Every structure is written in structure tokens, then in C-alpha cells.
Design a protein around this nucleic acid. Sequence first.
DNA 1: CGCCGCGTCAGACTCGTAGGATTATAGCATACGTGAGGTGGGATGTCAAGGCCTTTTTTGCCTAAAATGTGATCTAGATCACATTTTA
Length: 78
Amino acid sequence: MVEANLRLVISIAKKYTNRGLQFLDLIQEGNIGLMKAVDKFEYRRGYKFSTYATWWIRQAITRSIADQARTIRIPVHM
DNA sequence: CGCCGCGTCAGACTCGTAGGATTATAGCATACGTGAGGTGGGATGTCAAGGCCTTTTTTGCCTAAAATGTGATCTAGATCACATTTTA
């Protein structure tokens, strides 16, 4: 599953590899959200998988950029 | 053996001049801890009157005793117009 959907991970990743942090870190975090979605996904919902891990990936990257990527940590609320 | 290609590595010295950055990234719910706020409470620190001792300020006082007064009786100084008289 994971080795299959790596291209989803990288595709979504490089929408956000504008000069925020760096490519490969967005990619790696994307693989983390991917592994979550593989751990959680239900076939019985019968939907496509792409959407599910799209959400999960996007969460993971979207707050790893914010936790990291600065010398001064601004937490999520600000 | 002797190229050839690729790569590594230095490029003078002291002063001055200016301020200075930027893109876009979801959203709400749970639940937990830490910062700025209260809060009585030991405990410390202050400020105004009183009891131990010595010193200081009044102040007794203690007797040597030298000093302070009594006043009629004197005394040895002190004067002034005339008559010379001396000395530089």
C-alpha cells in the first residue's frame, strides 16, 4: 500500500514545497500521514483510498511545517 | 610509460557609505498545565515608652583661711610768677 501511494505523498507534498522549509521533509512527513491512513482506512466505507490519506497526509505536513520550520516555535493557535 | 580530464586551490593592505527582505500554508474539538492573580500569616522590621549602671550636671558641704571691709590720721609729693644765670 505505502510503496504504491508514495506518488500521492510526493504529489501533494510538492504543492507545499514552496520555499517554506524544504522538499524531502514535506515528503517524509507525508509518508507519516500515509502510514496513518494505511493503519486507519476501511474498505467497508467503499470509498477511494486517495481521499482518506489525502486528508491524513495533509494534516501531517500541514502541522510539521508549523511545529518545525522556525528557529522560534510559534504554537498552532497563533 | 606518458598522456588526458577532471578536479583543487590562491589571488596586497588600512580606512569610509547605506539600511535591508520574503510565500503560504484548514479547521474545530478535548483536555490538560502553567502564568499572573489572590491571600492569610509567620516573621521580620520599626517606633514609642520604661528598668540596669556610669557618667555627667547640679549641687551639698567642709573647713582653711586668705581675703574684704571700718575710717580718722598722717605723709611725701606738687605749684608759680619773679630773678637771674648758665651754655652753645
